[model samples]
Target: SMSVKKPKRDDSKDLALCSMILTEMETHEDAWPFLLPVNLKLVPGYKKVIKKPMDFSTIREKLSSGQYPNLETFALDVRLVFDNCETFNEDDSDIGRAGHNMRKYFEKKWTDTFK
Candidate 1:
């Protein structure tokens, strides 16, 4: 008879940490631009340039639904929001500046929590 393998590692702690981090980001003042997907009508050509658009709302849904396998994947989506912002907005512009601030905040939180 073969021994039964153990179940996968429990990720509840990581999930809780992700939820907390997401809440912090959602409440940040600079979060407005990254709250939802870019408005195609308002921002013409955004879809063309940003092939993989990501936003806080989408990440929230994925997190709530247990879609992320690990904290790394969750962080990837969060970073994508900032990357897309830098791609679409000029560095000196309002949204671009906000993106930079938000990215800095996120990296600090990620390092403090995970590293």
Candidate 2:
């Protein structure tokens, strides 16, 4: 099981929007080799790399706290989380390339849906 730090609150509109956008990528197998499940879901671990648990709940908490006020800003927040992960980046390996692509996917879609 993955360890988690609980979010401060359960209700946040921007967090919900972030979840909705991320859910859209659930069917993309190209992303599966990289991404982890969002908060409240269980994503199996792999031995190839150290995967970071996804936690949009924290994103929502921060949003509710006025950190990331909108979907655009929220996406940036998401990127920083993803980008900071050691396995995520603009590289050719499976984890590196796929994770960066997944992050960009949600970021792009979040922008498209809102504005």
Candidate 3:
């Protein structure tokens, strides 16, 4: 009993792009409230992932302005987030080859900084 976030389809055009892609995915598996019920009567190609939300103001602007625009552009943003996270992994340790060096690097920086 969740809400479905519908995608903004341009029946006139061929490809109907969603305004809020993230919200679409969130409500797809378990339709949450606030999620729009996408009417895919227009373009059948429109998948749940492709449906964009209406409130995606920030990303929407970026996309229209060529900033965070388009799926490929969004992919770049995703890569940047993951790549940044890789700088720190808990599975590594010293005396364990690369793990040891990585641990050492962490120690050298925030070693005694936290109380």
Candidate 4:
């Protein structure tokens, strides 16, 4: 007879860690540009350029709504925000430079916490 106990697949810890990381990112100085969705009125044609736009507020809503299946999924959304920034802003521009800085911080945090 083979009787093996199955391991639990709870992601509460992962969820909590992701939440903490998001809070840290939101408070970062370079977070201004990514704090909320790009204003369509302020930035005309932004939606035309970025097909799937993301932002900190949307990510938070997703998290609170239990939309993310795992930490990796949450991280993907976070990275998407930065990816969209780079796509819409010039590398040497203020928003682009902030995106780079924020990306650097996020990567370091990811490695430090998980790796």
Best by lDDT: 1
Clash list (residue pairs), candidate 4: none
Model 2, backbone clash pairs (residues 3+ apart or across chains), number: 0
Question: Compared with the true structure, what per-residue lDDT tens digits does model 4 show for residues 1-115?
Answer: 2787678676558878888999999999889999999998789879789999999999999999999988889889999999998888899999999999999999999999877
Candidate 1 scores a C-alpha RMSD against the true structure in Å of: 3.4
lDDT of 2 by residue, 23-79 (tens): 566566755543444433343332234344444455556655767655666666566
Give all TM-scores, in the order shown: 0.89, 0.46, 0.27, 0.88
Where does the lowest 10-residue lDDT sum fall in candidate 3?
Answer: 29-38
The TM-score obtained by model 1 is: 0.89
Each prediction's number of clashing residue pairs: 0, 0, 21, 0
How many clashes in candidate 4? 0
Residue pairs whose backbone atoms clash in candidate 1: none
Model 1: per-residue lDDT, tens digit, 1-115?
2687778666669999999999999999999999988888888899788999999999999999989988999999999999999998999999999999999999999999888
lDDT of 4 at 42: 85
Model 2 residue runs over 4 Å out of place are 1-16, 33-73, 85-90
Per-residue lDDT over 2-105 for candidate 3, one digit per residue giving the tens place of the 0 to 100 score:
67768864343211233334334333432221133334575354344343423223433555565643444554443332232233323343212333433343
Q: Candidate 1: what lDDT? A: 0.93
Worst 10 residues of 2 by lDDT: 39-48
The lDDT of model 4 is 0.91
